[PDB]
Amino acid sequence: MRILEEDLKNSTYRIRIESLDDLWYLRNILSEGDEVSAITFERERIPITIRLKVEKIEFQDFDNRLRILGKGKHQSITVTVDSEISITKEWDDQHIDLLKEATDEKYVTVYTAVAMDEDEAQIFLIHPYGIQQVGTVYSGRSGKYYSEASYFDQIVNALKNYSNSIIILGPGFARDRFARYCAQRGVNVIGSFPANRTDSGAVYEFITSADGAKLLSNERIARDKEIVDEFLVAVKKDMGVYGRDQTESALQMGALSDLIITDEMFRTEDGRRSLSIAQTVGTRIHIVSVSNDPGQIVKKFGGFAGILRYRV
């Protein structure tokens, strides 16, 4: 994301979408009734009171449903890479952060991860907020025992359409052989790290490992993982709290050191309500995104979770 200009007086920022992921960020930045402005076409502007946003994680287009103000009837703005937008609203800390994050290369890097066996390789894109399965190459080895080269070859083809640093994962050294195979084709990798299985789980676990940390411990995905794990360990050790009621409850009595709520519940009034209470009470805040599995966990628990402390 790129910030073109701003108007402090009217709480506005003009941002330019540069990547697909920028849409995900835009989506989290926009809310209920914000005022958005765009130039449509012999150029004409279109200011709007947002009423609904249409966007699915990993999409390439973003739709702002609305009511024109700059007349009166419903209309719509379609955001895509290269689009420019003026957003007016009250910018709380969470939203300002989304902006600082979207525009910082150090935080939005995308990696291509290949978790492979001797007979199967799954490719994923590690977005700064979640994992996106993007294919699967079977070696067929069982059915042909066969040249591992044409399997490795299948993997390289599936990777041609992407251009991010590569991380190779997997159980038995098939990863090492493949990394060596890629070096001969020019294609160089950060890669090759052991992993129990060959599924998404492997990617998250890599995120959680020493090497994973050195690489992306600051990205959202890694952060949401870190806290939700703490919570999971918390609940096991009888120091955790889940569910709106129970959590809000423990929050109110300054009995919890960490308040974990979801992406979704933050767009909720209780959500925003509890965040401030949390600041009053002296409790750390954590907004986990349902766009990754750590978020999914908290979602299932109700969207609210907390880690206990001796009543403050």
Same domain for 60 and 40: yes
Helix, strand and coil content of the chain, in percent to the nearest 5, comes to: 40, 30, 30
Same domain for 245 and 312: yes
Same domain for 311 and 227: yes
Tally the domains of the chain: 3
Counts of helices then strands in the chain (DSSP H, E)? 13, 16
Same domain for 281 and 243: yes
Same domain for 189 and 114: yes
Q: Which residue, 86, 104, 122, sits at the end of a domain?
A: 104
CA angle 271, 264, 301 (to 5 degrees): 85
DSSP string across 118-153: SSEEEEEEE-SS-EEEEEEEE--HHHH---HHHHHH
Same domain for 157 and 96: no
The greatest distance separating any two alpha carbons of the chain, rounded to the nearest whole angstrom, comes to 71
Domain residue limits at 227: 219-312
Q: CB 136: neighbour CB atoms within 10 A?
A: 11
Structure tokens at 23: 């849409």
Same domain for 204 and 226: no
Cβ-based neighbours of 229, under 8 Å, separated by 6 or more: 208, 294
Tell me if residue 181 falls in helix, strand or coil: helix
Same domain for 296 and 238: yes
Q: Give the amino acid at 11.
A: S
Structure tokens at 152: 């490795």
According to DSSP, residue 56 is labeled: -
Q: Which of 215, 160, 212 is nearest to 182 (CA)?
A: 160
Q: Which residue, 104, 121, 137, sits at the end of a domain?
A: 104
Q: How far apart are CA 268 and CA 283, in angstroms?
A: 19
Same domain for 183 and 160: yes
Same domain for 236 and 172: no
Method used to obtain the model: X-ray
Q: How far apart are CA 84 and CA 38, in angstroms?
A: 7
Q: Which residue, 54, 85, 104, sits at the end of a domain?
A: 104
Q: How far apart are CA 158 and CA 142, in angstroms?
A: 21
Residue linked to tokens 């200009």: 5
Expressed in Å, this structure's resolution amounts to 2.9
According to DSSP, residue 239 is labeled: -
Structure tokens at 222: 């890694």
